[model samples]
Target: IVGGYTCGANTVPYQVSLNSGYHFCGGSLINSQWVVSAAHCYKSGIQVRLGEDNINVVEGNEQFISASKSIVHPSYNSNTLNNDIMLIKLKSAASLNSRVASISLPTSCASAGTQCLISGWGNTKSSGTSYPDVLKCLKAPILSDSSCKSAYPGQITSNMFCAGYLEGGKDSCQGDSGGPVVCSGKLQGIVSWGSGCAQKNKPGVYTKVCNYVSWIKQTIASN
Candidate 1:
């Protein structure tokens, strides 16, 4: 989360850390047993830590749960990064409490210019070397789909959308992949990929959650 501030404890309850043997990515809990993240995170064993704030120390509010299974979207393109989303099933269900909760999925995509926010323990600077001990958050407004395409040319797809500062500086970075992008308090996007961390005119790209609603339902039911 480049150019962001540390979030309040349990501010975004659905925001969870995806541990690929250690801290590497952020994800969101859609239900007690289901987590949504980027398909790229499936490279290794994935575990989920919920209700966590200061990740440097395992706070009692956190619930560490192992992942039993992972399902990557069939069409996810590693090269072009199309359909870059993943779902993981926790080995056991999370016990809902004040510090743990699920976020509501959006019924439709957020229109252009929607005021959204993102949270993560990702890099605070473009050096991509420093990850925060506590979660960080920043406002990321929805960039016009046309403007986003203009910025990325043919790389931008309907499956993927863009958000961030038009002048750059505030955006998701390393370790923030698969994290939530909330608009109007609804889950709207997933941190997918970007050219670099908050580069000028290079807004952050995300997996448009609206494009995967049907797939999500089907994937969960089949698994």
Candidate 2:
């Protein structure tokens, strides 16, 4: 988990465990056969595990799906971490059940200071190495574009937004990329990059999902 608080089974039905050789990132299921994640999280032979509670053990309720194809945003910049979103297509559609579901995309952008939630199976601390088996979640309030820009200084781009407290602590860490940042119960952000794991005045950066709402719809509709 990223910050704290272990998620119960079906608590975050849309949250999926992304494995490429090992537990690496988290993703959100947006449709029966589609998942949204960060472009930097991609790797060959990637596997998507849905409706999973623990990463180490195989839960009977979980669905293991192979990634048939992936679409990284055309303008994704690894250096600046802008437009860092990606969509994964599964070989077979996911079976909807109480343990598996999809999250809704946002129609409008989120206002600054809006309280949001981010969950993942990442290390708690930056120096920590033990990745938790259970999912972890924490509250991350959205920061204003201006305030965010000041934090990173020319690093925050129009395609990205910032979340978490500036005072430090309570934020996503390593292995938390490609995760969902739920605002107002709608998926608003995608975990893109960050300066460090919950550092002072250094909030986690995310791809602004609302900014690419039209792109997402068009891509999914045609693909």
Candidate 3:
């Protein structure tokens, strides 16, 4: 089930090496030849390992693909985090295998008040540790436009969407940006920002995938 595979949920298709080791947290496979992730995830060489539950364990042979090129959204502004999206073109297409299947991007998005699923390996609580090896997921109801607008004030934009429970606790955290918020088996949003990971009246914000349909298609076609 998709929910059960949350451990590898919408992880960035690129790998970054920290002092300890390399890790991938945000990314999605767009096609046999391309993957999409955030520009920040490409600070180092690009690598994606698909179909693996534990980073340390090789349940089945994982798909290791090399990114030949990376295209960060032209309007992206690091300071404000506007248009924080990117695409990574693989040097070669991934071979179709049972464990690795490409996710479907939304052709259209739900309006305000539509519920969705957010999944990641991020910390379950704001001050808590990251979920052990496995992944975690939660259901977040879509925020009404007026509600989200009022909550975010001037930060809310048509290009973005907000979702989460208002009670606090339970959301994507530091390591979970660039992941996906899915609805009806289609990719609806990309984790962007939030009010410190699941606080009251401060749900997580995401890049509205529906707004980038043309860009996504063009990028995928070019690769």
Among these predicted structures, which one has the highest lDDT?
1
Instruction: Please estimate how well model 3 matches the true structure, expressed as its whole-model Cα lDDT.
Output: 0.66
Each prediction's whole-model lDDT (CA): 0.89, 0.87, 0.66
* Model 2 per-residue lDDT tens digits across residues 50-88: 988888887678888999998999998888878899999
Which portions of model 1 show Cα errors greater than 4 Å? none
Give per-model TM-scores: 0.97, 0.97, 0.85
State candidate 1's TM-score.
Answer: 0.97
The segments of candidate 2 whose C-alpha lies over 4 angstroms from its true place after superposition are: none
What are the per-residue Cα lDDT tens digits for candidate 3 across 63-164?
766677888888877766677678777678777555566777888788777777766555565765554465556777778888888788999877887887
Task: Locate the minimum summed-lDDT window of 10 residues in model 1.
Answer: 38-47
Q: Candidate 3 — which residues are off by over 4 angstroms?
A: 1-20
> Which scores better on lDDT, 1 or 3?
1
Residue range 19-101, candidate 1, lDDT tens digits: 76678889999999999999987765777999999888976788999999889899999998898999999999999876899
The residue pairs that clash in candidate 1, if any, are none
Pairs that clash in candidate 2: none
| CA RMSD of all predictions | 1.0, 1.1, 4.1
